[PDB]
Design a protein around this ligand. Structure first.
Ligand SMILES: O=C(O)CNC(=O)c1nc(Cl)c2ccccc2c1O
Ligand SMILES: [Mn+2]
Length: 217
């Protein structure tokens, strides 16, 4: 679907109502597979970090590490398609101009590609932007084909503010996710028992970012 139709008919309404929006079959199988290949290539070639230190035992050889990451600009060799995804995300947000809350998005971060090794590690409950650093929207694209949470875990659980219940999102292949980056969406990644890949970009609100530079300097 054209970025515009998706943004106007689904993304905008959903975000303003729930603060969370899931779009399946974003780029299609062919493009999705290419991004998956590039990401897997980055991993296999050692472009990722060793992973977040979860437990620091006395013996550093027993230390358990979690999610591995790598920042991607989208212009690097072998990351062309990742750049395409980023460009597609940008087009989508551009068409949401002035319709997502009262925000005015004028920029984004590079892409943060994350890999949960599948060794039982996840990500503790947290808020992406709890101190007003400018990030208003978190966008995540998943690349895990035939992912079955009942067997591999890795579910993204969001705890919507003021709502007793929570929203569980499986990291399904070619799935695109949007949610407010602030305290409205505390979330966690449940333990993953299979290699789990995701690509995240954060979009900045013009005003929040402008004044963030004042304090955080
Ligand atoms: O991957 C997911 O479904 C959800 N991931 C996250 O919420 C998440 N958040 C942050 Cl702030 C980081 C930060 C660093 C590395 C991985 C992260 C991560 O996967
Ligand atoms: Mn997060």
């Amino acid at each position: 679907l054209p970025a515009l139709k998706l943004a106007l008919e689904y993304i905008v309404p959903c975000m303003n109502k729930h603060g969370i929006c899931v779009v399946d079959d974003f780029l299609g199988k062919e493009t999705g597979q290419q991004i998956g290949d590039e990401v897997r290539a980055l991993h296999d070639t050692g472009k990722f970090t060793d992973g977040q230190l979860v437990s620091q035992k006395s013996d550093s050889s027993k230390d358990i590490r979690g999610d591995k990451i790598t920042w991607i600009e989208g212009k690097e060799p072998g990351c062309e398609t990742i750049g395409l995804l980023m460009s597609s995300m940008d087009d989508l947000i551009r068409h949401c101009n002035g319709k997502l809350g009262s925000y005015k998005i004028n920029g984004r971060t590079k892409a943060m590609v994350a890999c949960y090794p599948g060794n039982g590690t996840g990500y503790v409950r947290h808020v992406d932007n709890p101190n007003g650093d400018g990030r208003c929207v978190t966008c995540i694209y998943y690349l895990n084909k035939d992912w079955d949470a009942k067997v591999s875990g890795g579910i993204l659980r969001i705890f919507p503010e003021g709502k007793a219940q929570f929203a569980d999102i499986e990291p399904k292949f070619d799935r695109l996710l949007f949610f407010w980056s602030d305290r409205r969406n505390p979330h966690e990644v449940q333990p993953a028992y299979a290699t789990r890949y995701a690509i995240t970009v954060w979009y900045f609100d013009a005003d929040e970012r402008a004044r963030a530079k004042v304090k955080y300097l």
